[PDB]
């Protein structure tokens, strides 16, 4: 339909300008004939995400890098993608005309844009949000009465995510996680800074505690919204950091194990929310396997665990195999899931650097690494942030896909957003990860799937800046000829029958 109307920032490549009567955007999904794939290309030198066709031939004339389908060899099955709806997106959306808001909308949620399906909710404020709340800040009220949800929830989030809804392609599944508990909770009685719940699991405390996340899934339920999941804490290793600037709530994993077992389990379990999901960990790879032994290797906890929350901070190294290829070799019954990712953390990183082909290629790396290593999905922080990367309480550190300028009605898609949709747009829930053979060694990071209905998707990300000549094998129709482009990314769609 419309495509890309690029503007340069002076940075690697183009972000795609939107307004309130333009956005960029696809027709309606086209299934070509056996023998016949789609390709859809983004580069650096701004293509973003054009749709080309060309043949699956019986006869290859290719003699480079050869990559071959194993369809019969089925690996995990795919959850989903999307993002969070923080208090800072939801001003940054809401911060537009309507018209353009609903451009916004669509570009993430519609078919006519990437087919988000994931939406992260904070429970009450963190760092992005422009002040420090919970939904229980009247001092002991233990029994919650006086629990309810500000502004910021009614106003800005729920409304937000309704028209997500309304608009989305496929169902879409709501994640909640926690930052801080009300203060009178707290060891430190502080929204932020060294802090654990007080005294021990089991007690009043604690039974609050997860009193407050029954609360909050029976606040949403009247707003008639559903939660898939809820993450035991957001980051539990910050609140055990002195002087951790941002709201937190400290456990070490045998708080977190002992908490889940004794309160948040059975609490959930006791509710009309019992069928909502529980992930633990919710926090950065590094702390893997070693959280998953605490608290799995508890009959008491893992009964109530779903499964393994995982953030990183993509400007950081942490290797897959020791932390998520060990933990599933250790746990292979529990999902691992990416609840959070982010780029731009490092001091002397812009926190927004308005069309970095670099970061898009971390991003869509990132999804690769985790796809390989089991993980069932993967879900970006903040949907969208202004120029500078706020609004923050704190401090403006990291960047979004989608940054918002307010003073001109107009939103800016970065490669951030296409590299998501490389996936997100093609991987639908349910999918299954499967073999994707490479003949030799290469500079390629690649992954194969297959569609519920049986047909075949393939990313290829080239973050090298050599074009790399690539046949692509499917045993049950032919080859794929083409070539993958230096700094760029390629999804491969086909049927097979
Ligand atoms: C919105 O963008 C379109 C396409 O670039 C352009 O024709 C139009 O001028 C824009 N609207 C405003 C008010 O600038």
């Given at each position: 339909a419309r495509p890309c109307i690029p503007?340069?920032?002076?940075?690697?490549?183009?972000?795609?300008?939107?307004n309130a009567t333009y956005c960029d955007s696809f027709d309606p999904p086209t299934f070509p004939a056996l023998g016949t794939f789609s390709r859809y290309?983004?580069?650096?030198?701004?293509?973003?995400?054009?749709?080309?066709?060309?043949?699956?031939?019986?006869?290859?004339?290719?003699?480079?890098?050869?990559?071959?389908?194993?369809?019969?060899?089925?690996?995990?099955?795919?959850?989903?993608?999307?993002?969070?709806?923080?208090?800072?997106?939801?001003?940054?959306?809401?911060?537009?005309?309507?018209?353009?808001?609903?451009?916004?909308?669509?570009?993430?949620?519609?078919?006519?844009?990437?087919?988000?399906?994931?939406?992260?909710?904070?429970?009450?404020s963190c760092d992005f949000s422009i002040r420090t709340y919970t939904y229980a800040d009247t001092p002991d009220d233990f029994q919650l009465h006086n629990f309810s949800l500000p502004e910021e929830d009614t106003k800005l989030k729920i409304p937000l995510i309704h028209r997500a809804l309304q608009l989305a392609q496929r169902p879409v599944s709501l994640l909640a996680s926690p930052w801080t508990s009300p203060t009178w909770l707290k060891t430190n009685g502080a929204v932020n800074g060294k802090g654990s719940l007080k005294g021990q699991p089991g007690d009043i405390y604690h039974q609050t505690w997860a009193r407050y996340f029954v609360k909050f899934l029976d606040a949403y339920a009247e707003?008639?919204?559903?939660?898939?999941?809820?993450?035991?804490?957001?980051?539990?290793?910050?609140?055990?950091?002195?002087?951790?600037?941002?709201?937190?709530?400290?456990?070490?994993?045998?708080?977190?194990?002992?908490?889940?077992?004794?309160?948040?389990?059975?609490?959930?379990?006791?509710?009309?929310?019992?069928?909502?999901?529980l992930l633990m960990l919710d926090d950065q790879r590094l702390l893997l396997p070693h959280w998953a032994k605490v608290v799995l290797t508890?009959?008491?906890?893992?009964?109530?665990?779903?499964?393994?929350?995982?953030h990183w901070?993509?400007?950081?190294?942490?290797?897959?195999?020791?932390?998520?290829?060990?933990?599933?070799?250790?746990?292979?019954?529990?999902?691992?899931?990416?609840?959070?990712?982010?780029?731009?953390?490092?001091?002397?990183?812009?926190?927004?650097?308005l069309g970095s082909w670099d970061r898009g290629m971390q991003y869509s790396?990132?999804?690769?690494?985790?796809?390989?290593?089991?993980?069932?999905?993967?879900?970006?922080?903040?949907?969208?942030?202004?120029?500078?990367?706020?609004?923050?309480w704190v401090r403006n550190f990291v960047d979004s896909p989608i940054i918002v300028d307010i003073t001109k009605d107009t939103f800016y898609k970065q490669p951030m957003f296409?590299?998501?949709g490389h996936f997100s747009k093609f991987i639908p829930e349910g999918s299954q990860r499967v073999g994707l053979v490479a003949s030799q060694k290469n500079d390629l990071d690649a992954v194969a799937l297959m569609h519920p209905?049986?047909?075949?998707?393939?990313?290829?990300?080239?973050?090298?800046?050599?074009?790399?000549?690539?046949?692509?094998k499917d045993p049950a129709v032919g080859f794929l000829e083409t070539i993958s482009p230096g700094y760029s990314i390629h999804t491969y769609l086909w049927h097979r029958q």
């Open positions: 503007k340069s920032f002076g940075y690697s490549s183009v972000v795609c300008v939107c290309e983004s580069t650096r030198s701004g293509r973003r995400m054009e749709l080309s066709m060309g043949p699956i031939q019986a006869n290859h004339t290719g003699t480079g890098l050869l990559l071959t389908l194993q369809p019969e060899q089925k690996f995990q099955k795919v959850k989903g993608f999307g993002g969070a709806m923080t208090d800072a997106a939801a001003l940054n959306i809401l911060a537009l005309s309507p018209p353009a808001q609903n451009l916004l909308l669509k570009s993430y949620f519609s078919e006519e844009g990437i087919g988000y399906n994931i939406i992260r909710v904070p429970m009450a707003h008639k919204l559903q939660f898939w999941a809820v993450t035991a804490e957001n980051e539990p290793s910050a609140g055990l950091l002195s002087g951790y600037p941002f709201q937190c709530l400290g456990f070490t994993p045998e708080h977190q194990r002992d908490f889940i077992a004794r309160d948040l389990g059975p609490t959930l379990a006791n509710s009309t929310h019992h069928n909502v999901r508890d009959p008491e906890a893992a009964k109530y665990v779903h499964g393994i929350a995982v901070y993509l400007d950081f190294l942490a290797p897959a195999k020791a932390t998520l290829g060990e933990t599933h070799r250790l746990f292979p019954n529990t999902m691992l899931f990416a609840s959070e990712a982010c780029v731009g953390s490092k001091f002397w990183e812009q926190s927004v650097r790396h990132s999804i690769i690494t985790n796809l390989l290593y089991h993980v069932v999905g993967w879900t970006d922080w903040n949907l969208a942030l202004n120029p500078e990367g706020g609004p923050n296409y590299h998501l209905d049986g047909s075949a998707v393939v990313v290829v990300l080239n973050r090298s800046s050599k074009d790399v000549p690539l046949t692509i």
